[PDB]
Structures are given as C-alpha cells and as structure tokens.
Amino acid sequence: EDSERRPSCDIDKPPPNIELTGNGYNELTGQFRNRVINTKSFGGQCRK
Amino acid sequence: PHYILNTRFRKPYNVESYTPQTQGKYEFILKEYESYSDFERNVTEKMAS
C-alpha cells in the first residue's frame, strides 16, 4: 500500500509491442512462436 | 502492464500472449476472354434458253 520511491517514476509506457519481441521464432515453417523471454521485466532499474 | 495501440489492456490468467500481427497478403486474379465468329455464303445461278 505504502509504495515508496515513487514507483516507475511516472514513466507510463514500454515499447509498443515488446511482447512480439519476446515471442520465439521457427525457421523451417516461417511462422513465429509463443512468448519465451519475459522482456516486460524491469529489475527495478527504470531506464527512461 | 500491456500496451496495444496506445491503449492499456489486461491479460487474463488463461491467455498466454495476445499480440497484434500485421501478416497481410491479398491476391487478385482477373480474367478477360472473347471469341468472334462470322460466316456468309452468297449463291446465285441463272439459266436461259
């Protein structure tokens, strides 16, 4: 409830569709695959 | 947080990932064909004796 350090320092949005960047890739079928790497992480380190 | 077209969305617990993909391909095949045919035969014969 008492959120210290002003979470996210008033930063609103990530890149538009980084979820597609998190998605996998297939080579022999040319069709993409599911999200594997959680690019939506932040590690606390707000990079503005 | 989830962002789609400058709009903040919610991902439910059952959906793994819902990402908008462009993936656009259209095909347009038009056909044109015409055929003409004409025939005419004039025949005239006269005999007098």
Side-chain angles (χ1 to χ4, degrees):
Chain A
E1 291 181 353
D2 192 1
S3 296
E4 297 88 4
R5 296 182 294 171
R6 193 84 279 278
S8 71
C9 63
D10 289 331
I11 300 300
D12 196 2
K13 72 183 299 295
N17 201 351
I18 197 169
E19 295 85 4
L20 272 173
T21 80
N23 281 317
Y25 171 72
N26 194 359
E27 55 182 2
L28 291 177
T29 62
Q31 295 295 322
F32 294 159
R33 294 296 180 186
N34 300 328
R35 161 254 197 91
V36 173
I37 296 170
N38 201 160
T39 60
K40 274 76 67 179
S41 177
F42 304 106
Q45 285 75 241
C46 53
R47 295 172 68 189
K48 58 278 289 180
Chain B
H2 286 283
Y3 256 113
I4 292 170
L5 291 178
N6 297 322
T7 297
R8 302 175 49 85
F9 285 103
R10 290 302 95 199
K11 184 173 72 174
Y13 181 75
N14 288 319
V15 173
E16 177 176 0
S17 180
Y18 180 75
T19 62
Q21 189 178 4
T22 305
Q23 199 60 255
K25 78 282 286 182
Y26 291 170
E27 65 93 18
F28 184 77
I29 295 171
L30 177 60
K31 301 293 184 183
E32 291 182 354
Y33 176 81
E34 291 177 353
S35 178
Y36 290 160
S37 178
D38 182 74
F39 182 75
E40 185 178 1
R41 181 179 291 171
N42 250 318
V43 171
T44 303
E45 183 179 1
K46 187 176 180 180
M47 182 180 72
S49 179

mmCIF file of all heavy atoms in Angstrom, chain A residues 6-44:
data_model
loop_
_atom_site.group_PDB
_atom_site.id
_atom_site.type_symbol
_atom_site.label_atom_id
_atom_site.label_comp_id
_atom_site.label_asym_id
_atom_site.label_seq_id
_atom_site.Cartn_x
_atom_site.Cartn_y
_atom_site.Cartn_z
ATOM 1 N N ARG A 6 8.387 6.329 -5.303
ATOM 2 C CA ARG A 6 7.544 6.749 -6.420
ATOM 3 C C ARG A 6 7.653 5.746 -7.562
ATOM 4 O O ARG A 6 8.353 6.007 -8.550
ATOM 5 C CB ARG A 6 7.923 8.155 -6.893
ATOM 6 C CG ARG A 6 6.910 8.790 -7.838
ATOM 7 C CD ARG A 6 5.769 9.449 -7.073
ATOM 8 N NE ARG A 6 4.752 8.489 -6.651
ATOM 9 C CZ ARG A 6 3.772 8.044 -7.429
ATOM 10 N NH1 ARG A 6 3.665 8.473 -8.680
ATOM 11 N NH2 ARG A 6 2.892 7.171 -6.957
ATOM 12 N N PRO A 7 7.005 4.587 -7.444
ATOM 13 C CA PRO A 7 7.194 3.505 -8.422
ATOM 14 C C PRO A 7 7.077 3.970 -9.868
ATOM 15 O O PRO A 7 6.200 4.763 -10.219
ATOM 16 C CB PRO A 7 6.081 2.516 -8.063
ATOM 17 C CG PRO A 7 5.820 2.762 -6.620
ATOM 18 C CD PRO A 7 6.012 4.235 -6.416
ATOM 19 N N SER A 8 7.989 3.474 -10.704
ATOM 20 C CA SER A 8 8.081 3.739 -12.139
ATOM 21 C C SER A 8 8.400 5.194 -12.461
ATOM 22 O O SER A 8 8.427 5.555 -13.643
ATOM 23 C CB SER A 8 6.801 3.329 -12.878
ATOM 24 O OG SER A 8 5.724 4.194 -12.567
ATOM 25 N N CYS A 9 8.650 6.029 -11.448
ATOM 26 C CA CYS A 9 8.986 7.447 -11.594
ATOM 27 C C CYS A 9 8.169 8.135 -12.683
ATOM 28 O O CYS A 9 8.719 8.881 -13.501
ATOM 29 C CB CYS A 9 10.489 7.622 -11.848
ATOM 30 S SG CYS A 9 11.157 6.894 -13.364
ATOM 31 N N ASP A 10 6.862 7.874 -12.701
ATOM 32 C CA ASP A 10 5.909 8.489 -13.627
ATOM 33 C C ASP A 10 6.174 8.117 -15.085
ATOM 34 O O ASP A 10 5.708 8.809 -15.996
ATOM 35 C CB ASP A 10 5.876 10.013 -13.469
ATOM 36 C CG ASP A 10 5.224 10.449 -12.170
ATOM 37 O OD1 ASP A 10 4.342 9.718 -11.672
ATOM 38 O OD2 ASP A 10 5.593 11.522 -11.650
ATOM 39 N N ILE A 11 6.914 7.039 -15.332
ATOM 40 C CA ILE A 11 7.077 6.529 -16.690
ATOM 41 C C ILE A 11 5.890 5.633 -17.016
ATOM 42 O O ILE A 11 5.540 4.737 -16.239
ATOM 43 C CB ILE A 11 8.407 5.775 -16.839
ATOM 44 C CG1 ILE A 11 9.581 6.704 -16.527
ATOM 45 C CG2 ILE A 11 8.542 5.215 -18.243
ATOM 46 C CD1 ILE A 11 9.661 7.912 -17.434
ATOM 47 N N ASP A 12 5.266 5.873 -18.169
ATOM 48 C CA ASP A 12 3.984 5.258 -18.496
ATOM 49 C C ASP A 12 4.130 4.002 -19.349
ATOM 50 O O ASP A 12 3.647 2.934 -18.967
ATOM 51 C CB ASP A 12 3.084 6.280 -19.204
ATOM 52 C CG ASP A 12 1.626 5.859 -19.228
ATOM 53 O OD1 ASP A 12 1.302 4.792 -18.665
ATOM 54 O OD2 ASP A 12 0.804 6.596 -19.810
ATOM 55 N N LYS A 13 4.789 4.107 -20.502
ATOM 56 C CA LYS A 13 4.664 3.011 -21.448
ATOM 57 C C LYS A 13 6.014 2.388 -21.790
ATOM 58 O O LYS A 13 7.044 3.069 -21.793
ATOM 59 C CB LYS A 13 3.984 3.480 -22.741
ATOM 60 C CG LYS A 13 4.827 4.375 -23.626
ATOM 61 C CD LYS A 13 4.027 4.835 -24.831
ATOM 62 C CE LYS A 13 3.572 3.655 -25.676
ATOM 63 N NZ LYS A 13 4.715 2.921 -26.288
ATOM 64 N N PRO A 14 6.033 1.086 -22.055
ATOM 65 C CA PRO A 14 7.197 0.459 -22.686
ATOM 66 C C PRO A 14 7.130 0.637 -24.193
ATOM 67 O O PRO A 14 6.245 1.348 -24.690
ATOM 68 C CB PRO A 14 7.052 -1.017 -22.279
ATOM 69 C CG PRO A 14 5.584 -1.209 -22.150
ATOM 70 C CD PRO A 14 5.029 0.092 -21.633
ATOM 71 N N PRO A 15 8.044 0.037 -24.958
ATOM 72 C CA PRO A 15 7.866 -0.007 -26.416
ATOM 73 C C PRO A 15 6.524 -0.614 -26.781
ATOM 74 O O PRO A 15 5.953 -1.390 -25.997
ATOM 75 C CB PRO A 15 9.036 -0.887 -26.894
ATOM 76 C CG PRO A 15 9.636 -1.479 -25.651
ATOM 77 C CD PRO A 15 9.370 -0.480 -24.578
ATOM 78 N N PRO A 16 5.984 -0.283 -27.968
ATOM 79 C CA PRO A 16 4.581 -0.611 -28.275
ATOM 80 C C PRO A 16 4.197 -2.070 -28.079
ATOM 81 O O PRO A 16 3.261 -2.371 -27.333
ATOM 82 C CB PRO A 16 4.448 -0.203 -29.749
ATOM 83 C CG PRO A 16 5.486 0.846 -29.942
ATOM 84 C CD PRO A 16 6.637 0.438 -29.072
ATOM 85 N N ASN A 17 4.908 -2.982 -28.734
ATOM 86 C CA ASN A 17 4.545 -4.395 -28.747
ATOM 87 C C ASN A 17 5.767 -5.264 -28.471
ATOM 88 O O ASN A 17 6.065 -6.214 -29.198
ATOM 89 C CB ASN A 17 3.881 -4.775 -30.065
ATOM 90 C CG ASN A 17 3.040 -6.031 -29.952
ATOM 91 O OD1 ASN A 17 3.069 -6.722 -28.935
ATOM 92 N ND2 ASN A 17 2.269 -6.321 -30.993
ATOM 93 N N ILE A 18 6.503 -4.926 -27.408
ATOM 94 C CA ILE A 18 7.656 -5.712 -26.983
ATOM 95 C C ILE A 18 7.288 -7.173 -26.734
ATOM 96 O O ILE A 18 8.171 -8.039 -26.704
ATOM 97 C CB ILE A 18 8.288 -5.068 -25.727
ATOM 98 C CG1 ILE A 18 9.712 -5.583 -25.505
ATOM 99 C CG2 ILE A 18 7.424 -5.324 -24.500
ATOM 100 C CD1 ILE A 18 10.484 -4.817 -24.452
ATOM 101 N N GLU A 19 5.998 -7.468 -26.554
ATOM 102 C CA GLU A 19 5.566 -8.853 -26.409
ATOM 103 C C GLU A 19 5.862 -9.668 -27.661
ATOM 104 O O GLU A 19 6.159 -10.866 -27.567
ATOM 105 C CB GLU A 19 4.074 -8.903 -26.079
ATOM 106 C CG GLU A 19 3.711 -8.296 -24.730
ATOM 107 C CD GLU A 19 3.509 -6.794 -24.795
ATOM 108 O OE1 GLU A 19 3.577 -6.231 -25.910
ATOM 109 O OE2 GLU A 19 3.285 -6.176 -23.734
ATOM 110 N N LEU A 20 5.784 -9.047 -28.842
ATOM 111 C CA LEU A 20 6.194 -9.734 -30.063
ATOM 112 C C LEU A 20 7.695 -9.986 -30.076
ATOM 113 O O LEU A 20 8.155 -11.009 -30.599
ATOM 114 C CB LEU A 20 5.772 -8.933 -31.296
ATOM 115 C CG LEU A 20 4.365 -9.202 -31.834
ATOM 116 C CD1 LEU A 20 4.013 -8.232 -32.945
ATOM 117 C CD2 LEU A 20 4.265 -10.631 -32.335
ATOM 118 N N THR A 21 8.476 -9.063 -29.512
ATOM 119 C CA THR A 21 9.912 -9.290 -29.390
ATOM 120 C C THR A 21 10.198 -10.451 -28.447
ATOM 121 O O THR A 21 11.169 -11.192 -28.632
ATOM 122 C CB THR A 21 10.606 -8.022 -28.898
ATOM 123 O OG1 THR A 21 10.444 -7.913 -27.479
ATOM 124 C CG2 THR A 21 9.989 -6.799 -29.554
ATOM 125 N N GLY A 22 9.362 -10.618 -27.420
ATOM 126 C CA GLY A 22 9.502 -11.756 -26.529
ATOM 127 C C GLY A 22 9.134 -13.084 -27.156
ATOM 128 O O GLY A 22 9.486 -14.135 -26.609
ATOM 129 N N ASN A 23 8.435 -13.063 -28.289
ATOM 130 C CA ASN A 23 7.996 -14.293 -28.934
ATOM 131 C C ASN A 23 9.170 -15.036 -29.566
ATOM 132 O O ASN A 23 10.175 -14.441 -29.962
ATOM 133 C CB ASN A 23 6.942 -13.993 -29.999
ATOM 134 C CG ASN A 23 5.563 -13.767 -29.408
ATOM 135 O OD1 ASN A 23 5.132 -14.491 -28.513
ATOM 136 N ND2 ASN A 23 4.860 -12.762 -29.912
ATOM 137 N N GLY A 24 9.028 -16.355 -29.653
ATOM 138 C CA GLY A 24 10.024 -17.192 -30.282
ATOM 139 C C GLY A 24 9.977 -17.092 -31.799
ATOM 140 O O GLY A 24 9.279 -16.269 -32.392
ATOM 141 N N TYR A 25 10.754 -17.966 -32.434
ATOM 142 C CA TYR A 25 10.871 -17.992 -33.884
ATOM 143 C C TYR A 25 11.095 -19.417 -34.366
ATOM 144 O O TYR A 25 11.809 -20.194 -33.727
ATOM 145 C CB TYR A 25 12.018 -17.092 -34.364
ATOM 146 C CG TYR A 25 12.338 -17.224 -35.837
ATOM 147 C CD1 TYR A 25 11.476 -16.722 -36.804
ATOM 148 C CD2 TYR A 25 13.504 -17.850 -36.259
ATOM 149 C CE1 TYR A 25 11.769 -16.840 -38.151
ATOM 150 C CE2 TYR A 25 13.802 -17.973 -37.601
ATOM 151 C CZ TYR A 25 12.932 -17.467 -38.543
ATOM 152 O OH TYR A 25 13.228 -17.588 -39.882
ATOM 153 N N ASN A 26 10.480 -19.750 -35.499
ATOM 154 C CA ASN A 26 10.693 -21.018 -36.179
ATOM 155 C C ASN A 26 11.232 -20.741 -37.577
ATOM 156 O O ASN A 26 10.812 -19.784 -38.234
ATOM 157 C CB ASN A 26 9.398 -21.834 -36.260
ATOM 158 C CG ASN A 26 9.642 -23.278 -36.656
ATOM 159 O OD1 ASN A 26 10.777 -23.685 -36.899
ATOM 160 N ND2 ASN A 26 8.571 -24.061 -36.724
ATOM 161 N N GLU A 27 12.158 -21.585 -38.029
ATOM 162 C CA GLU A 27 12.879 -21.343 -39.276
ATOM 163 C C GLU A 27 12.311 -22.118 -40.460
ATOM 164 O O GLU A 27 12.154 -21.551 -41.547
ATOM 165 C CB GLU A 27 14.367 -21.673 -39.090
ATOM 166 C CG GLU A 27 14.650 -23.084 -38.590
ATOM 167 C CD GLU A 27 16.130 -23.344 -38.388
ATOM 168 O OE1 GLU A 27 16.934 -22.415 -38.606
ATOM 169 O OE2 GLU A 27 16.489 -24.482 -38.013
ATOM 170 N N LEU A 28 11.996 -23.400 -40.279
ATOM 171 C CA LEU A 28 11.540 -24.222 -41.394
ATOM 172 C C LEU A 28 10.077 -23.989 -41.748
ATOM 173 O O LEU A 28 9.645 -24.400 -42.830
ATOM 174 C CB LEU A 28 11.767 -25.703 -41.085
ATOM 175 C CG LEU A 28 13.231 -26.150 -41.039
ATOM 176 C CD1 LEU A 28 13.339 -27.618 -40.652
ATOM 177 C CD2 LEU A 28 13.914 -25.890 -42.374
ATOM 178 N N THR A 29 9.306 -23.346 -40.869
ATOM 179 C CA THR A 29 7.899 -23.082 -41.127
ATOM 180 C C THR A 29 7.596 -21.619 -41.412
ATOM 181 O O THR A 29 6.492 -21.315 -41.880
ATOM 182 C CB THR A 29 7.041 -23.550 -39.943
ATOM 183 O OG1 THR A 29 7.409 -22.819 -38.765
ATOM 184 C CG2 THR A 29 7.238 -25.037 -39.695
ATOM 185 N N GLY A 30 8.532 -20.709 -41.147
ATOM 186 C CA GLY A 30 8.302 -19.298 -41.380
ATOM 187 C C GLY A 30 7.258 -18.656 -40.494
ATOM 188 O O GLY A 30 6.931 -17.484 -40.700
ATOM 189 N N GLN A 31 6.727 -19.381 -39.515
ATOM 190 C CA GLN A 31 5.714 -18.867 -38.605
ATOM 191 C C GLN A 31 6.311 -18.682 -37.217
ATOM 192 O O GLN A 31 7.067 -19.534 -36.737
ATOM 193 C CB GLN A 31 4.505 -19.804 -38.537
ATOM 194 C CG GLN A 31 3.732 -19.911 -39.842
ATOM 195 C CD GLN A 31 3.074 -18.603 -40.237
ATOM 196 O OE1 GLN A 31 2.567 -17.868 -39.392
ATOM 197 N NE2 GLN A 31 3.079 -18.306 -41.533
ATOM 198 N N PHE A 32 5.969 -17.567 -36.578
ATOM 199 C CA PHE A 32 6.510 -17.252 -35.266
ATOM 200 C C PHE A 32 5.894 -18.158 -34.201
ATOM 201 O O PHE A 32 4.930 -18.889 -34.441
ATOM 202 C CB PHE A 32 6.262 -15.784 -34.927
ATOM 203 C CG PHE A 32 7.011 -14.826 -35.806
ATOM 204 C CD1 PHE A 32 6.591 -13.514 -35.939
ATOM 205 C CD2 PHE A 32 8.132 -15.240 -36.506
ATOM 206 C CE1 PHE A 32 7.275 -12.633 -36.751
ATOM 207 C CE2 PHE A 32 8.821 -14.362 -37.319
ATOM 208 C CZ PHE A 32 8.391 -13.058 -37.441
ATOM 209 N N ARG A 33 6.470 -18.098 -33.000
ATOM 210 C CA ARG A 33 6.018 -18.942 -31.901
ATOM 211 C C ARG A 33 5.699 -18.116 -30.660
ATOM 212 O O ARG A 33 5.636 -16.885 -30.721
ATOM 213 C CB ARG A 33 7.065 -20.009 -31.583
ATOM 214 C CG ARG A 33 7.251 -21.024 -32.698
ATOM 215 C CD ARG A 33 5.979 -21.823 -32.927
ATOM 216 N NE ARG A 33 6.129 -22.809 -33.994
ATOM 217 C CZ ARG A 33 5.137 -23.557 -34.467
ATOM 218 N NH1 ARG A 33 3.916 -23.433 -33.966
ATOM 219 N NH2 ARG A 33 5.367 -24.429 -35.438
ATOM 220 N N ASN A 34 5.494 -18.792 -29.533
ATOM 221 C CA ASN A 34 4.973 -18.154 -28.337
ATOM 222 C C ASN A 34 6.048 -17.336 -27.623
ATOM 223 O O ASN A 34 7.246 -17.448 -27.894
ATOM 224 C CB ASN A 34 4.401 -19.200 -27.383
ATOM 225 C CG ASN A 34 3.279 -19.994 -28.007
ATOM 226 O OD1 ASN A 34 2.527 -19.478 -28.832
ATOM 227 N ND2 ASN A 34 3.154 -21.258 -27.617
ATOM 228 N N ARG A 35 5.586 -16.497 -26.697
ATOM 229 C CA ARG A 35 6.476 -15.682 -25.883
ATOM 230 C C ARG A 35 7.273 -16.558 -24.923
ATOM 231 O O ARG A 35 6.702 -17.354 -24.171
ATOM 232 C CB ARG A 35 5.658 -14.635 -25.125
ATOM 233 C CG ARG A 35 6.338 -14.003 -23.925
ATOM 234 C CD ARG A 35 5.747 -14.561 -22.639
ATOM 235 N NE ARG A 35 6.044 -13.735 -21.474
ATOM 236 C CZ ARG A 35 5.265 -12.746 -21.046
ATOM 237 N NH1 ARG A 35 4.141 -12.460 -21.690
ATOM 238 N NH2 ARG A 35 5.605 -12.047 -19.974
ATOM 239 N N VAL A 36 8.598 -16.409 -24.954
ATOM 240 C CA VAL A 36 9.511 -17.217 -24.157
ATOM 241 C C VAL A 36 10.310 -16.359 -23.183
ATOM 242 O O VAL A 36 10.383 -16.659 -21.986
ATOM 243 C CB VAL A 36 10.459 -18.045 -25.054
ATOM 244 C CG1 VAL A 36 11.519 -18.737 -24.214
ATOM 245 C CG2 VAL A 36 9.667 -19.058 -25.869
ATOM 246 N N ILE A 37 10.915 -15.282 -23.676
ATOM 247 C CA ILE A 37 11.732 -14.393 -22.860
ATOM 248 C C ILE A 37 10.854 -13.250 -22.376
ATOM 249 O O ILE A 37 10.283 -12.507 -23.183
ATOM 250 C CB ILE A 37 12.945 -13.868 -23.644
ATOM 251 C CG1 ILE A 37 13.875 -15.022 -24.026
ATOM 252 C CG2 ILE A 37 13.695 -12.822 -22.831
ATOM 253 C CD1 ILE A 37 14.956 -14.634 -25.008
ATOM 254 N N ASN A 38 10.743 -13.107 -21.056
ATOM 255 C CA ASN A 38 9.923 -12.060 -20.450
ATOM 256 C C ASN A 38 10.666 -10.737 -20.579
ATOM 257 O O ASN A 38 11.416 -10.325 -19.694
ATOM 258 C CB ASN A 38 9.616 -12.391 -18.995
ATOM 259 C CG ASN A 38 8.395 -11.662 -18.469
ATOM 260 O OD1 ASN A 38 7.796 -12.075 -17.477
ATOM 261 N ND2 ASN A 38 8.021 -10.572 -19.128
ATOM 262 N N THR A 39 10.451 -10.060 -21.707
ATOM 263 C CA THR A 39 11.026 -8.741 -21.925
ATOM 264 C C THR A 39 10.301 -7.648 -21.150
ATOM 265 O O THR A 39 10.821 -6.532 -21.051
ATOM 266 C CB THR A 39 11.014 -8.399 -23.418
ATOM 267 O OG1 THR A 39 9.666 -8.413 -23.902
ATOM 268 C CG2 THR A 39 11.839 -9.407 -24.203
ATOM 269 N N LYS A 40 9.123 -7.944 -20.600
ATOM 270 C CA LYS A 40 8.368 -6.979 -19.811
ATOM 271 C C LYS A 40 8.956 -6.752 -18.426
ATOM 272 O O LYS A 40 8.409 -5.942 -17.670
ATOM 273 C CB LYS A 40 6.910 -7.433 -19.684
ATOM 274 C CG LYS A 40 6.017 -7.011 -20.842
ATOM 275 C CD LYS A 40 6.258 -7.866 -22.077
ATOM 276 C CE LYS A 40 5.814 -9.301 -21.852
ATOM 277 N NZ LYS A 40 6.018 -10.142 -23.062
ATOM 278 N N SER A 41 10.039 -7.443 -18.077
ATOM 279 C CA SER A 41 10.679 -7.246 -16.785
ATOM 280 C C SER A 41 11.222 -5.824 -16.667
ATOM 281 O O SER A 41 11.319 -5.083 -17.647
ATOM 282 C CB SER A 41 11.809 -8.256 -16.587
ATOM 283 O OG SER A 41 12.477 -8.039 -15.358
ATOM 284 N N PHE A 42 11.564 -5.441 -15.440
ATOM 285 C CA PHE A 42 12.169 -4.139 -15.191
ATOM 286 C C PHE A 42 13.376 -4.181 -14.270
ATOM 287 O O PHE A 42 14.219 -3.278 -14.358
ATOM 288 C CB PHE A 42 11.133 -3.170 -14.602
ATOM 289 C CG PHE A 42 9.908 -3.004 -15.455
ATOM 290 C CD1 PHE A 42 8.708 -3.592 -15.089
ATOM 291 C CD2 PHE A 42 9.953 -2.260 -16.622
ATOM 292 C CE1 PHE A 42 7.578 -3.442 -15.871
ATOM 293 C CE2 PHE A 42 8.828 -2.108 -17.409
ATOM 294 C CZ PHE A 42 7.639 -2.697 -17.032
ATOM 295 N N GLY A 43 13.500 -5.184 -13.402
ATOM 296 C CA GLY A 43 14.620 -5.280 -12.487
ATOM 297 C C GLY A 43 14.711 -4.134 -11.499
ATOM 298 O O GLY A 43 15.702 -4.012 -10.771
ATOM 299 N N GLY A 44 13.683 -3.292 -11.459
ATOM 300 C CA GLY A 44 13.696 -2.111 -10.619
ATOM 301 C C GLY A 44 14.401 -0.933 -11.262
ATOM 302 O O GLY A 44 14.086 0.224 -10.968
#
